[PDB]
């Protein structure tokens, strides 16, 4: 039982992480579209938005 009392804890830690995922992804949608909207007609480079494949 002592192994599952924290097993749920890990899940809620994971769930908080998953909620964190969506939270910024909404930020990343907005920020990207701001930058893209200001790119038309300019030489603005293509800054990445994801670090790299594993």
């Amino acid at each position: 039982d002592s192994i599952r009392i924290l097993g749920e804890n890990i899940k809620i830690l994971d769930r908080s992480m998953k909620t964190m995922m969506e939270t910024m992804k909404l930020m990343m949608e907005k920020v990207d579209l701001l930058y893209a909207s200001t790119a038309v007609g300019t030489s603005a480079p293509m800054l990445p938005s994801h670090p790299a494949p594993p």
């Binding site: 990207d32 579209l33 909207s37 790119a39 038309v40 994801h50 494949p53």
Partner: protein, 1609 residues
């Protein structure tokens, strides 16, 4: 080489001519300026010139063509045996080719083609003046000068090509129109076509208005049709266009066409390319394109919000589909605030219906990874000719240096050669695609390098838009990204979208389309036709970013899709308009808003073609759901059809109005402003797959379709035949297609070959009749697939055609040899055979190029510098393929069908597919072939020389007489040398000889097929419906191995070979005729002989169609008798002993008795079939599709199984199922009736009375139940479980658990194992009560219940008195009476059926013994129209037996108590007083033994029915009145036996009181339902049972309620 095109394939650009006109200083300009006249027109008005071209009449001698076409059509039709239509066909061809206007158009086409040929693919820069009648064409480099008169129209070569294509299209249109009109009820509509041509050619309006008119012709015609014929939903589509305000003559002509026939209007209006194409106004078109790629119809905030909503609905649909396909939710993470309903649904792995209306609840659900992005596309997508730009630095190679210099004053710094390839195949060859995951890595990051951020827009050719539509060519990296994304979406995501998923499964599509066609006519499902125009230049990043993010998460490809969703904002766009280049600042394009544009909101046409489809389905679903309708969104492109079903509370008009309002609202939110110009609702016209459908029936595409490497005659003819074959595959009639194809083929031959060949009528005919199967040019004639749909051997057809030609026409066999020039190859080429099972082993001289497969492979293997190619070609694939084919050649009983099957599921087959896909690319062939100009000249010279040699080929005399089946067998034997067998299939026309039943002899009827027309057919019926009906290779090999083991082949060679394949993969352990067919009831009563049968059926229907279209009419049924006996080979499959051990090795570098089991399976299969049938309503029963294809079975196979086993299995399944009242009631009502794949097909299986008496359940049950017809006995037998538990629970004892575990996935497997169990039972012949002069009166008489009892007995007694041996019975006689007469021994019955077996079929169905089948002569009965000798049924005539009913019974016959009739024969009375009853023996079931002299048997039946009625009373909602009547019949019999009076009417009160059945004549409870039964009469059969001592025994032990009902108070 200059002028390297023979057909229009590029947009009609005009900037080049403008540049050369005023600018430019090249030498050609000096000559060009010299030849222009004062009134020099502009290229944009080129069509205004070519319309004035007139040729002198009768310039090209073609009468030879007319005669040759006549002969060819005559020969083809005569071979098909539809001779009577030869008149129509060849008269139509002659009329088409003799009309002055048509001939003028044809000559113009010929002149255009000759001019094109003489200049195209030439090396000379300039070609002297060429006469085109009154024109003076002159060619300079790539420019053309037209000088009809003192007027010049200097144009580009593409303009001249467009003019030539227009002339050719008009020729096709005219010929097709004439032929098509010749085969109608409303024929001869050519005049209207010519009037339309003149009207359009008389238009002098400006360029833009003219092309607007031409473009609008078709939508305006659709609007005209809809407005007049819409019945429920209004329409205004017609009013939107400006044709009447612009060209009134055209409008009047179109309205006249509508008044004539809507289908004609739609067909004529379909053509959209027989009118000159426009010169795209690049200056304005490009500007508007760029502007439309950056306009914002909605603020980005609203677009993002609506994108979130679309993400919600997308999640909902995906979850629904996944649950429906896997019964479990995907891996999802519920955000805080998730609705408890979603949590519960996820926990239970279900899908509550409430979600569909509450998609918003899914905003809090996030889908986790479900798969991985397949960053390794298959070669099929990569190997493609789609043009691409290697990188940014190549942008300077899409413009003319001179024009750039003249437009800016500075040179264009182009490097000497392009920095990379120009097409995807070249990129793959160069090794640039060997590391795709590394190539797409920047996309994963989201920072696509600068070098791959350029897109070149390309105007699209052959489109009637003045401002043109541009399709984008992308960089190599972007193209690979597009391919990967499309593959991922179409494979892992798109299928799971439930609502959208039912838009690509062809089964679902076909079912939905059939439902729409059947439902639209009456009107309960109108269709909304969405057609987005700005779709391609639509979607903004805001709208799709949410779904992009969701997809990214689902595929665990971080910021991959979103990369493409925001990419175009950092992309440079340039218009591919040479002679108008953008300025070059630092080696990069400079934005100007006309030629170049840096960054745009959308990515342009042809990108994310799938994602946009998903989004469109999403918002359409959102729009329609909120208005609570029933939609079936259908379509994939910018045009989509929405099907809306009728609501029970709103008329279709209001429903359509609300749907349109909702769609407008919910498409505006997506930045896709929708206009009335592209939205119409109708219940008459609906378009899908570029095919109009008027009132359900498809609109013929004859007019349109028939109007559609280095050049060569073979390629042109092949394209012609393929186009005509596709048109025929469409609803286009085969005959119009064939005639038009023959005419076009003759024209094409006329264009190329010299006069020495053309002016030889016999040679031209023979050449046109020699197909590719025998080694000739592809011709429309030799195409058996024109009419049929499935695979067909072409060789027998070719031989039959040649045979007919030799027999009829004056052509001699020597000429056939001269034309064919058979040349058997020196050595067998097994690879070709395995690729084409039906082909001969001959040298295809006219093939443009053979053995090029090795040449392509060798060129690819070397000069590659790649990695994927190297590992894909590490040794010659062609050599290994030849080795595998030679290995497969050892099949002792050669079966090239199997070889092709076995070869197909091998890696080398995939390799060959890749190789010949490489060959498909255009210039990669030139890369291997390294110029073509000589080849084209060489090829022509070769064929021209070919058709001169008088030297014969292999003598064909022996292979032209006799049956063509034997001829094909012998030919294959000769051309391969070891007796190929198993693929030749007969030619239906030879196999069967249609005949009219009006005149036909018995010898003609022995073997034949019946065709019964329900009513007189005519031209109306032809167009109106009637009433009558990867690793996957692993799975493929597994199923094939099962299919083999079950055939019982267990050969070590095959086992090892298949295991080798599996370890290579890693495993280790019609349409055109159905409409008419619906008016034909079909039968087969010869029992001789798959897929080829469908060909025979289609041929019969074709005979009907021909005899109608020839002006005739069919009233009497017709036949298709068997003619060529030798064509009926007796097939007996043998083993595939491979003989020599297989040597192919492997590649690995590419990429209890079955009767019981079957009987139990049949019982359960039938049980579930009934279970699904009961659910279906009246509107869902017309479909004959049983649960799982229960129909594709023979009759003998079923009769092999002991029917007792099946009956017990079905009974056990039924009792085990134990359905509640609703289903039981549905079964009872429908089984007493008969509908659908139900008791119908049961009765279909149970004609043979042998099964009945031999059915163990029935014989025991026969004395227990009473029936009235064979259609009631079977129903009682199959309903026994729920009516008579007394016996069913006795036979339920038999059971076996392992039999239950027998899965149905292998249902056909047990049938095959039981194919040859033994021999079916016999029929026996049970007797009827006979009479003799000296006999004993036993008192038994057949048909006791029937009123015709006395009549039937009198006829029997008369017959026996007359000692007749042969008797004729007309259909007028009572069916029961004839049956009784049939049962008489030592008598022959000849029904006067006149070729209709309905009456005879009825007699068989009623009878329960073999008397009818044994004593009724079928060959004579179907061949008899009037009696010959003694007959019954006529009121008068020689030998006619007549019964005159006596007004008063003046005689008491010893056998018959009252003689109610007097027998007369040819006006002479027949004395029958001395006749007496013959000793009776085992009687037939027609005597109704179930109720026998033994009253205890009647007691058993009466008690059983009483119990059944009591059980029925407990069934709520069941109409019990029908059953009570049969029970009352037994009650009347019992009352007669007891002596009680037989009341005419009796009132019964029925109901459930205190949870118990009640059936009493007196109402003792208010809830009892009163039911009155009238017409009750005492059954004379009950008289025999009315024994005085038998009265007491009846009531002993009977139920009190039954006793009360029997006794009348």
């Amino acid at each position: 080489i200059n002028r390297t095109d023979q057909s229009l394939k590029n947009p009609l650009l005009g900037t080049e001519v403008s540049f050369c006109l005023k600018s430019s200083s090249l030498p050609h300009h000096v000559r060009a300026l010299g030849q222009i006249k004062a009134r020099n027109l502009a290229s944009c008005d080129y069509y205004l010139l070519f319309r004035q071209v007139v040729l002198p009449p009768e310039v090209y001698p073609i009468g030879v063509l007319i005669r040759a076409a006549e002969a060819i059509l005559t020969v083809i039709v005569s071979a098909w045996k539809l001779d009577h239509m030869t008149k129509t066909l060849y008269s139509s061809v002659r009329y088409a080719l003799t009309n002055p206007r048509v001939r003028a158009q044809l000559e113009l086409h010929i002149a255009y083609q000759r001019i094109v040929g003489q200049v195209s693919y030439s090396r000379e820069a300039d070609i002297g003046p060429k006469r085109l009648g009154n024109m003076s064409l002159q060619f300079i480099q790539s420019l053309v000068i037209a000088t009809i008169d003192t007027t010049s129209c200097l144009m580009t070569y593409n303009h001249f090509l467009a003019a030539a294509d227009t002339a050719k299209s008009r020729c096709h249109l005219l010929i097709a129109s004439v032929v098509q009109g010749a085969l109608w009820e409303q024929g001869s509509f050519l005049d209207h076509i010519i009037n339309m041509i003149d009207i359009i050619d008389s238009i002098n309006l400006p360029h833009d208005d003219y092309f607007t008119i031409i473009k609008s012709i078709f939508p305006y015609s659709q609007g005209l049709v809809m407005g007049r014929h819409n019945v429920s939903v209004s329409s205004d589509f017609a009013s939107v266009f400006a044709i009447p305000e612009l060209c009134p003559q055209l409008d009047s002509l179109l309205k006249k066409l509508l008044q004539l026939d809507p289908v004609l209007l739609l067909m004529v209006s379909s053509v959209q390319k027989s009118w000159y194409f426009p010169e795209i106004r690049m200056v304005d078109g490009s500007r508007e394109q760029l502007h439309k790629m950056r306009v914002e119809l909605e603020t980005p905030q609203a677009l993002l919000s609506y994108g979130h909503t679309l993400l919600s609905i997308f999640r909902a649909e995906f979850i629904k589909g996944y649950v429906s396909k896997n019964a479990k939710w995907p891996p999802v993470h519920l955000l805080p605030g998730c609705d408890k309903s979603i949590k519960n649904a996820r926990e239970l792995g279900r899908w509550s219906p409430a979600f569909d209306r509450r998609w918003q609840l899914f905003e809090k659900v996030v889908i986790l990874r479900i798969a991985d992005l397949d960053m390794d596309p298959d070669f099929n997508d990569i190997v493609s000719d789609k043009a691409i730009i290697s990188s940014r630095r190549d942008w300077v190679f899409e413009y003319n240096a001179a024009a750039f210099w003249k437009k800016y004053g500075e040179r264009l710094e182009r490097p000497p050669a392009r920095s990379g390839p120009s097409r995807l195949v070249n990129a793959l060859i160069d090794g640039r695609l060997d590391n795709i995951p590394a190539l797409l890595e920047p996309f994963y990051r989201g920072a696509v390098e600068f070098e791959d951020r350029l897109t070149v827009l390309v105007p699209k050719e052959k489109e009637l838009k003045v401002k043109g539509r541009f399709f984008s060519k992308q960089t190599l990296a972007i193209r690979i990204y597009q391919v990967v994304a499309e593959a991922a979406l179409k494979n892992e995501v798109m299928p799971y979208l439930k609502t959208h998923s039912m838009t690509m499964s062809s089964t679902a599509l076909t079912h939905l389309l059939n439902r729409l066609s059947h439902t639209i006519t009456k009107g309960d499902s109108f269709v909304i036709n969405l057609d987005y125009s700005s779709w391609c230049n639509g979607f903004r990043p805001e709208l799709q970013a949410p779904i992009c993010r969701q997809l990214d998460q689902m595929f665990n490809c971080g910021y991959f899709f979103r990369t493409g969703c925001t990419l175009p904002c950092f992309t440079t766009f340039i218009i591919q308009d040479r002679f108008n280049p953008p300025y070059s600042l630092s080696g990069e394009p400079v934005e100007d808003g006309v030629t170049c544009a840096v960054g745009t909101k959308t990515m342009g046409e042809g990108m994310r073609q799938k994602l946009w489809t998903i989004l469109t389905s999403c918002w359409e679903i959102i729009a329609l759901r909120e208005i609570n309708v029933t939609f079936n969104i259908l379509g994939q492109g910018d045009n989509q059809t929405i099907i809306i079903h009728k609501s029970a509370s709103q008329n279709n008009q209001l429903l359509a109005e609300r749907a349109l309002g909702a769609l407008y609202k919910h498409a505006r939110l997506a930045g896709h402003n929708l206009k009335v110009e592209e939205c119409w609702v109708s219940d008459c016209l609906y378009e899908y797959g570029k095919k109009l459908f008027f009132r359900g029936v498809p609109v013929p595409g004859c007019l349109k379709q028939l109007s559609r490497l280095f050049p060569n005659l073979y390629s042109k003819l092949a394209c012609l035949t393929s186009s005509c074959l596709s048109a025929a595959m469409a609803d286009t009639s085969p005959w119009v297609a064939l005639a038009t194809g023959v005419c076009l083929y003759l024209i094409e031959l006329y264009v190329e070959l010299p006069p020495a060949i053309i002016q030889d009528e016999s040679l031209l005919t023979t050449l046109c009749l020699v197909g590719p199967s025998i080694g000739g040019l592809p011709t429309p004639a030799t195409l058996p697939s024109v009419f049929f749909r499935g695979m067909s051997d072409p060789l027998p057809f070719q031989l039959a055609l040649l045979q007919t030609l030799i027999k009829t026409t004056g052509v001699t066999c020597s000429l056939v040899n001269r034309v064919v020039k058979l040349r058997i190859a020196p050595y067998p080429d097994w690879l070709s055979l395995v690729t084409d099972p039906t082909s001969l082993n001959i040298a295809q001289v006219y093939r443009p190029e053979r053995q090029i497969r090795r040449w392509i492979e060798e060129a690819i293997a070397t000069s590659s510098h790649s990695s994927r190619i190297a590992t894909f070609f590490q040794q010659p694939l062609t050599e290994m393929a030849q080795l595998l084919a030679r290995d497969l050649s050892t099949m002792m009983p050669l079966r090239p069908r199997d070889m092709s099957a076995l070869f197909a599921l091998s890696n080398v087959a995939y390799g060959l597919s890749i190789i010949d896909l490489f060959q498909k690319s255009s210039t990669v062939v030139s890369a291997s072939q390294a110029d073509v100009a000589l080849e084209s000249v060489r090829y022509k010279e070769s064929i021209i020389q070919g058709l001169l040699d008088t030297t014969e080929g292999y003598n064909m005399q022996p292979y032209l007489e006799g049956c063509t089946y034997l001829a094909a067998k012998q030919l294959r034997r000769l051309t391969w040398g070891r007796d190929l067998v198993g693929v030749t299939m007969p030619f239906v026309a030879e196999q069967f000889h249609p005949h009219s039943s009006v005149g036909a002899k018995a010898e003609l009827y022995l073997d034949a097929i019946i065709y019964c027309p329900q009513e007189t057919l005519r031209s109306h019926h032809l167009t109106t419906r009637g009433d009558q009906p990867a690793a996957n290779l692993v799975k493929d090999t597994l199923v094939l191995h099962q299919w083999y083991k079950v055939r019982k082949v267990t050969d070590p060679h095959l086992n090892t070979l298949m295991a080798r394949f599996l370890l290579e993969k890693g495993y280790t352990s019609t349409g055109y005729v159905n409409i008419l067919s619906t008016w034909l009831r079909f039968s087969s009563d010869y029992l001789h002989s798959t897929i080829h049968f469908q060909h025979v059926f289609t041929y019969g229907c074709l005979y009907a169609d021909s005899v109608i279209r020839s002006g005739g009419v069919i009233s009497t049924p017709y036949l298709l008798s068997a003619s060529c006996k030798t064509c009926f080979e007796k097939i007996d499959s043998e083993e595939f002993v491979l003989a020599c051990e297989p040597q192919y090795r492997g590649a690995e570098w590419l990429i209890f008795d079955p009767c019981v089991s079957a009987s139990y399976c049949l019982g359960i299969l039938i049980g579930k079939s009934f279970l699904v049938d009961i659910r279906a309503s009246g509107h869902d029963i017309m479909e004959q599709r049983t649960w799982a294809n229960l129909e594709r079975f023979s009759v003998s196979d079923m009769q092999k199984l002991p029917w007792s086993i099946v009956i017990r299995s079905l009974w056990r399944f039924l009792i085990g199922a134990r359905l509640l009242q609703f289903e039981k009631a549905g079964l009872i009502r429908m089984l007493y009736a008969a509908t659908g794949p139900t008791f119908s097909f049961l009765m279909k299986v149970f004609q043979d009375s042998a099964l009945l008496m031999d059915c163990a359940p029935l014989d025991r049950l026969s004395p227990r139940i009473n029936f009235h017809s064979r259609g009631d006995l079977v129903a009682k037998l199959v309903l026994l479980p729920f009516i008579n538990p007394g016996i069913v629970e006795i036979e339920v004892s038999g059971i076996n658990s392992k039999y239950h575990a027998v899965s149905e996935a292998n249902m056909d497997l047990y049938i095959a194992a039981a194919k040859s169990v033994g021999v079916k039972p016999t029929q026996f012949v049970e007797e009827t009560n006979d009479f003799t002069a000296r006999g004993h009166h036993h008192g038994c008489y057949s048909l006791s219940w029937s009123k015709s009892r006395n009549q039937s007995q009198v006829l029997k007694m008369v017959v026996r008195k007359l000692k007749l041996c042969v008797l004729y019975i007309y259909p007028t006689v009572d069916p029961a009476v004839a049956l009784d007469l049939c049962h008489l021994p030592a008598l022959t019955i000849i029904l006067v059926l006149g070729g209709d077996p309905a009456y005879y079929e009825r007699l068989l169905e009623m009878d329960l013994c073999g008397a009818v089948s044994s004593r009724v002569d079928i060959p004579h009965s179907l061949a008899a129209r009037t009696h010959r000798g003694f007959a019954v049924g006529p009121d008068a005539g020689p030998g006619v037996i007549r019964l005159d009913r006596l007004e008063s019974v003046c005689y008491a016959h010893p056998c018959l108590e009252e003689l109610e009739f007097n027998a007369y024969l040819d006006s002479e009375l027949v004395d029958i007083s001395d006749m007496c009853c013959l000793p009776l023996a085992t009687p037939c079931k027609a005597l109704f033994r179930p109720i026998y002299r033994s009253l205890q048997s009647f007691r058993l039946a009466l008690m059983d029915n009483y119990s059944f009625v009591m059980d029925l009373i407990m069934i709520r909602g069941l109409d019990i009145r029908p059953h009570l009547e049969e029970f009352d019949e037994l009650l009347v019999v019992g009352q007669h036996i007891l002596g009680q009076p037989v009341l005419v009417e009796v009132v019964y009160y029925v109901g459930v009181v205190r949870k118990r059945p009640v059936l009493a004549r007196h109402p003792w409870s208010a809830d009892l339902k009163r039911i009155t039964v009238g017409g009750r009469a005492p059954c004379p059969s009950a008289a025999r049972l009315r024994d005085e001592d038998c009265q007491g025994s009846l009531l002993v032990g009977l139920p009190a309620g039954l006793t009360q009902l029997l006794i009348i108070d």
